[PDB]
Design a binder for this molecule. Structure first.
Ligand code: SF4
Length: 83
């Protein structure tokens, strides 16, 4: 079950960024964002995931203030976690 503040499929920004809480149900291959092969991309290896926000599999994303994403998710702003 998702937290009460999970990003939902109906969120305008989630729709624009093609977020899904499950990267295996995402269009990461179509987008071909740079930095890793697409099949390797998900929130846990993204620069915007906030490891100090949330609990467990439900962590912050800087692009979704006040909400939580799933570490196993993906969106089209995926960017390699570089620091
Ligand atoms: S920006 Fe990164 S951490 Fe945030 S939802 Fe998209 S892939 Fe996940």
């Amino acid at each position: 079950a998702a937290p009460a503040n999970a990003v939902t499929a109906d969120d305008p920004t989630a729709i624009a960024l093609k977020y899904n809480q499950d990267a295996t149900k995402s269009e990461r291959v179509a987008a071909a964002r740079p930095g890793l092969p697409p099949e390797e991309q998900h929130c846990a290896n993204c620069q915007f995931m906030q490891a100090n926000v949330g609990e467990g599999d439900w962590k912050g994303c800087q692009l979704f203030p006040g909400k939580l994403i799933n570490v196993n998710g993906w969106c089209a702003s995926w960017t390699l976690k570089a620091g």
